Design a protein around this ligand. Sequence first.
Ligand SMILES: *[C@@H]1O[C@H](CO)[C@@H](O)[C@H](O)[C@H]1NC(C)=O
Lengths: 49, 68
Amino acid sequence: FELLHAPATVCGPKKSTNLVKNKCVNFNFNGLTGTGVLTESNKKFLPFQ
Amino acid sequence: FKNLREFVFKNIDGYFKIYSKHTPINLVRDLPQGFSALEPLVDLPIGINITRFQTLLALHAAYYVGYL
Ligand SMILES: *[C@@H]1O[C@H](CO)[C@@H](O)[C@H](O)[C@H]1NC(C)=O
């Protein structure tokens, strides 16, 4: 396992635990950590955002 | 030549970073004024040290060079 200053590329896939809504849960993601309420939103995200 | 191929090359933290954008133009001898941001980007986790630049061009043309 060789790691460089560049962003890593050989990652390990997890189980993306099923998601829920309207209740306080931990929202830990690939790069985000914390707890909160996850609802549905209609923002206009860019393909690289 | 309506096709404009705007690129950005950068080496930070041991990876080669690139940007691109294709946009029609009208003038070929000078870059026209206007704003169009270069969203696309691809990271290359190489680690290669780069200090010299050579343009690779096919031989059986005009271009501009700037510095950040
Ligand atoms: C080569 O790049 C590394 C990081 O990618 C840097 O630490 C080192 O100083 C660079 N060396 C030269 C000669 O540019």
